[PDB]
Amino acid sequence: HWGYGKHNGPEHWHKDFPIAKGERQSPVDIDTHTAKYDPSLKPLSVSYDQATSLRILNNGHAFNVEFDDSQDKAVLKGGPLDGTYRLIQFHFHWGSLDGQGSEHTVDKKKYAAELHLVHWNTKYGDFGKAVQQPDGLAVLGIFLKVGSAKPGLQKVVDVLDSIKTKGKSADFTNFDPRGLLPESLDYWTYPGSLTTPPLLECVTWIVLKEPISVSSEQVLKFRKLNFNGEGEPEELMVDNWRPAQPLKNRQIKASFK
Amino acid sequence: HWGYGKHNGPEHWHKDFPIAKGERQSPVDIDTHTAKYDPSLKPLSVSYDQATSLRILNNGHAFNVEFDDSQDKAVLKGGPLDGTYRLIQFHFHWGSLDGQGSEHTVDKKKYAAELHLVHWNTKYGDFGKAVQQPDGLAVLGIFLKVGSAKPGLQKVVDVLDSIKTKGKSADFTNFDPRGLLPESLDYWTYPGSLTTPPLLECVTWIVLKEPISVSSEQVLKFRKLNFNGEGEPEELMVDNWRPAQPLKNRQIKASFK
Ligand SMILES: *C(=O)c1ccc(S(N)(=O)=O)cc1
Ligand SMILES: *C(=O)c1ccc(S(N)(=O)=O)cc1
Ligand SMILES: [Zn+2]
Ligand SMILES: [Zn+2]
Ligand SMILES: [Zn+2]
Ligand SMILES: [Zn+2]
Ligand SMILES: [Zn+2]
Ligand SMILES: [Zn+2]
Ligand SMILES: [Zn+2]
Ligand SMILES: [Zn+2]
Ligand SMILES: [Zn+2]
Ligand SMILES: [Zn+2]
Ligand SMILES: [Zn+2]
Ligand SMILES: [Zn+2]
Ligand SMILES: [Zn+2]
Ligand SMILES: [Zn+2]
Ligand SMILES: [Zn+2]
């Protein structure tokens, strides 16, 4: 099974998931010299007021907060997107140290972590069908840096002891994903992939300019999760990020000047 | 994710897995009026003397006992097979009640459960390559009925509380799969598929005429496993069987009169 170790990590994924060497792999470095303002980009519309969180789970790679996606209760519209994209889950990638953790980079700067809000195009009926289409998914990416506590993160951090090991979950209701947003929704966009196997080239990436602050205490809780199952030797869940992949022919567009 | 429930069960698999309606799907009903004796069928050769069991796991569908398959320590030869097929794992399918559980049926009779010993053709180098070939796999199917205890099953039943939930596994060494066999190796054979997604049409089915007896105590322990993971509400692992699929143009051959 794939992971982030010496023998099963990003360098090895291509052996089991051939698309790992595809033409539209994520993440990428965002060079602010070439990622030019596009005045044709319509404003981004985030509609999270009625978001219904269901569960949180350790899947052995990250932790996922899952949402009720049977209705348009939490949707992304506008920006680069045609149609309605329903929030299915969010998760983070983070480092062993503050100087690393983000998948995307900005002028090669790595952040402490990266938040991925995962949405699928309602045009396709379910998530499984959406991942087979270039316009199937929209992932909202938000950078994390270490400073002040993020109050909206506290409810997540406070349940992580209940899902320390792989295959554990917990009921996780009334979580407001608006409390994880920065002030600006100014963004970069480019066509890309899932950053974990199966690495499918189905994602419109929307990466926010403005990082959120989390406390070193909040990021320390992330680093105390385990990759391993209960009863196995401890492997700390850290450095669960894929490095920058070749931009190849793609255009990164900025929503801002 | 696929399963055995109202919305994700065998009736619905075709929506996600088009091969579910393929030309060689398993299981099938074995009608003893049309499944005729074939005098050309060689005796079956089961060579399990050096079988090396490694681990047992709850994968959320059944429980698998895994074998060291790096050598010809546990192989199926003869009968309808060209070449050597290495034992990789066995698992069962079973019901909520004694009147159902088997995948294959004989003259429409369902048994309480069915054991699948899974082997792959050494011609193809590994299991992953073997599942892509029509002659890649050989599954030995054995029917379970409720009567006397199967002594050879007790070591399996005794470890099931330790793998109650999905993802759980345990060391499971020195298990002798010969202790799960009936006295007669008389069999039916036909070309078919995996009975679970991905339902690949890669299997020579060898189904034994003679069922084994298990105790009602032994089958009760099967019914106490969980489909769910740790932290989810209990869903009993019962009725993890696919019903009879259309025979279409296939010939079922009997090794016996
Ligand atoms: C699977 O549902 C999946 C895999 C990767 C990602 S990412 N890291 O590209 O946001 C999302 C979902
Ligand atoms: C997977 O390796 C797999 C799936 C199904 C079966 S079955 N039920 O056809 O014996 C065996 C192996
Ligand atoms: Zn290579
Ligand atoms: Zn590999
Ligand atoms: Zn530059
Ligand atoms: Zn709102
Ligand atoms: Zn995984
Ligand atoms: Zn859903
Ligand atoms: Zn991600
Ligand atoms: Zn702005
Ligand atoms: Zn536990
Ligand atoms: Zn249908
Ligand atoms: Zn489906
Ligand atoms: Zn589907
Ligand atoms: Zn008949
Ligand atoms: Zn599964
Ligand atoms: Zn089976």
**End-to-end CA separation in angstroms for chain B:** 43
| C-beta of B196 in contact with ligand 2 (< 6 A) | yes
Residue B151 burial by CB count (10 A; 0-12/13-18/19+): exposed, middle or buried? exposed
Are residues B90 and B64 in contact, defined by beta-carbon separation less than 8 angstroms? yes
DSSP state string for chain A? ---SSTTTSGGGGGGT-GGGGSSS-S--EE-TTTS-B-TTPPPEEEE-TT--EEEEEE-SSSEEEEE--SSSSSEEEETT--S-EEEEEEEEEE-SSTT---SSEETTBPPSEEEEEEEEEGGGSSHHHHTTSTTSEEEEEEEEEESS--GGGHHHHTTGGGG-STTBEEE--S--GGGG--S---EEEEEE--SSTT--S-EEEEEESSPEEE-HHHHHHHTT-BSSPTTSPP-B-----PPPPP-TTPPPEES--
Q: Which of B157, B136, B161 is nearest to B92 (CA)?
A: B157
Q: Which two tokens stand for residue B70?
A: 């790096």
Kindly report the protein residue whose alpha carbon is nearest to atom 10 of ligand 2: B116
- Find out whether B7 is annotated in a ligand binding site: no
- Could B166 and A167 be called an inter-chain contact, meaning their C-beta atoms sit closer than 8 Å? yes
Query: How many Cβ pairs within 8 Å bridge chains A and B?
Result: 26
Question: Residues for chain B: how many in total?
Answer: 257
* Nearest chain B alpha carbon to A163: B231
Is the CB of residue A240 below 6 angstroms from any atom belonging to ligand 1? no
What distance in angstroms lies between residue A82's CA and the mean position of ligand 14's atoms? 21
- The fourth-level CATH superfamily of domain B1-257 is Alpha carbonic anhydrase (3.10.200.10)
Is B116 known to sit in a ligand binding site?
Answer: yes
CA separation (Å) from B12 to A215, B3, B4, B21? Answer: 46, 9, 9, 11
**Domain-by-domain residue ranges, chain A?**
1-257
Question: How far apart are alpha carbons A179 and B107 in whole angstroms?
Answer: 61
Kindly determine whether residue B230 and residue A168, on different chains, have CB atoms separated by under 8 Å. yes
| CB distance B194 to ligand 2 below 6 Å | yes
Is there an atom of ligand 2 within 6 Å of B221 CB? Answer: no
Ligand 2 centroid to Cα of residue B196, in Å, is 6
- For residues B86 and B127, is the Cβ–Cβ distance under 8 A? no
Q: What is the 3-state secondary structure (H, E, C) of A3-70?
A: CCCCCCCHHHHHHCCHHHHCCCCCCCEECCCCCCECCCCCCEEEECCCCCEEEEEECCCCEEEEECCC
Nominal resolution (angstroms): 2.2
B61 is catalytic: yes
Among B135, B168, B158, smallest CA distance to B55 is for B168
Q: Do B138 and B204 touch, CB atoms closer than 8 A?
A: yes
Identity of the amino acid at A82: D
User: By what method was this entry solved?
Assistant: X-ray
Atom of ligand 2 nearest to the CA of B203: 9
Residue B240 CA to its chain's centroid (Å): 11
- Separation of alpha carbons B210 and B142, rounded Å: 8
Taking the CA of residue A190 and the nearest CA in chain B, the distance in Å comes to: 29
Residue with tokens 């004694």: B98
Phi and psi angles of residue B60, each rounded to the nearest 5 degrees, phi first: 90, -5
- Distance from Cα B244 to the centre of ligand 14, integer Å: 23
Pairing between strand A137-146 and A203-208?
parallel
Distance between Cα A120 and ligand 6 center (Å): 18
Nearest CA to ligand 2 atom 9: B194
Beta bridge partners of A157: none
| Residue bearing tokens 């269901």 | A54
Pick the residue whose CA is nearest to atom 8 on ligand 1: A195
- What is the Cα B147 distance to its own chain's centre? 20
Three-class DSSP labels, chain B: CCCCCCCCCCCCHHHCCHHHHCCCCCCCEECCCCCCECCCCCCEEEECCCCCEEEEEECCCCEEEEECCCCCCCEEEECCCCCCEEEEEEEEEECCCCCCCCCCEECCECCCEEEEEEEEEHHHCCHHHHCCCCCCEEEEEEEEEECCCCHHHHHHHCCHHHHCCCCCEEECCCCCHHHHCCCCCCEEEEEECCCCCCCCCCEEEEEECCCEEECHHHHHHHCCCECCCECCCCCECCCCCCCCCCCCCCCCEECCC
Question: Can you say how many angstroms the Cα of residue B32 is from the centroid of all Cα atoms in its chain?
Answer: 21
Question: What's the distance, Cα to Cα, between the start and end of chain A in Å?
Answer: 43
Task: Select from B200, B25, B32 the least CA-distant residue to B106.
Answer: B32
Q: Which of B163, B232, B234, B235 to mutate to test the interface with A (most CBs of A within 10 A)?
A: B232
CA atoms of B57 and B114, how far apart (whole Å): 18
Chain B nearest C-alpha distance from A55 (Å): 9
Q: What does the radius of gyration of chain B's CA atoms come to, in whole angstroms?
A: 17
